[PDB]
Design a protein around this ligand. Structure first.
Ligand SMILES: O=C(O)/C=C/c1ccc(O)cc1
Ligand SMILES: O=C(O)/C=C/c1ccc(O)cc1
Lengths: 158, 159
């Protein structure tokens, strides 16, 4: 049961992110802190694979031009992520902050408008600090913008 | 672990055959032997290398072409997985990238500005590792010539 998993983790650089593996090919996610705290995304098509017993890999590309490849080892409460940010997302991360689904064309208009190279690459580990299977296609799991303290509320059950 | 120094050849399920040499904890060389971009070879590519668990590793990086790569290797299981994020133009005009990159880095940069980037062409595949020899560290000769038809066999055999 890896699909359906709902995790919160904290990258070694202090960023706190939340992902929900909704399908074998779809995720939702929320960013709670860091350069781009506030951003949240739903129905992001993704490549999900099992690499071995215990290890998984969720990778995809964004309407922003950002390319992501996450590896999860939940048994070990650990994961690794590498994010390839187009220059402009580093310069102007605030553009990307919103509920993406409502403004997809904005992200596309933006990645053409602003500069792409050199990319800003963030490769970090993270500690998983929450893991609850919510079953498959559970649309309510990630359904509101993040707010200060939300991660605690989730972890507390509150 | 004793993963640095490794020299592997593998074949992606889409039929592409590639060759990598893990030269350092932060550097690779590589050769592409078939597929859309057969002929391409690269040296001293800075990379992010990590151990994720016992047996599993991850080499990821970005190219002067704009291509972003994240490879996972599980050598014990003679298997690996790769995802490659190609800028549109590399899919349209892969021949540009077919080069000893080091001699023409600025070409790649001039190109990724000149041509279109979006939508990207994403290739996420498994591959079977068909060769694995540790060649120790900073062995500069391991990958030192452009690939030729049959080269992978020659390596696997002995020449
Ligand atoms: O959770 C991750 O691994 C990456 C999250 C992310 C959120 C917004 C971005 O613009 C890029 C990455
Ligand atoms: O898997 C590898 O070792 C290299 C892949 C690759 C894909 C596109 C390129 O333009 C160069 C290398």
């Amino acid at each position: 049961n890896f699909i359906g998993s709902h995790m919160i983790y904290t990258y070694e650089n202090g960023w706190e992110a939340e992902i929900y593996i909704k399908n074998d090919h779809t995720i939702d996610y929320r960013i709670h802190s860091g350069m781009v705290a506030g951003r949240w995304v739903r129905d992001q098509e993704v490549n999900i694979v099992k690499l071995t017993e215990g290890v998984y890999k969720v990778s995809w590309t964004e309407p922003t031009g950002t390319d992501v490849s996450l590896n999860f080892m939940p048994n070990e409460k650990r994961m690794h992520g590498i994010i390839f940010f187009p220059k402009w997302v580093h310069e102007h991360p605030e553009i990307t902050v919103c509920y993406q689904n409502d403004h997809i064309d904005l992200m596309k208009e933006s990645r053409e408008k602003y500069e792409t190279y050199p990319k800003y690459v963030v490769p970090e580990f993270a500690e998983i600090t929450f893991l609850k299977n919510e079953g498959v296609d559970n649309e309510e799991v990630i359904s509101k913008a993040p707010y200060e303290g939300m991660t605690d509320d989730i972890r507390a059950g509150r």
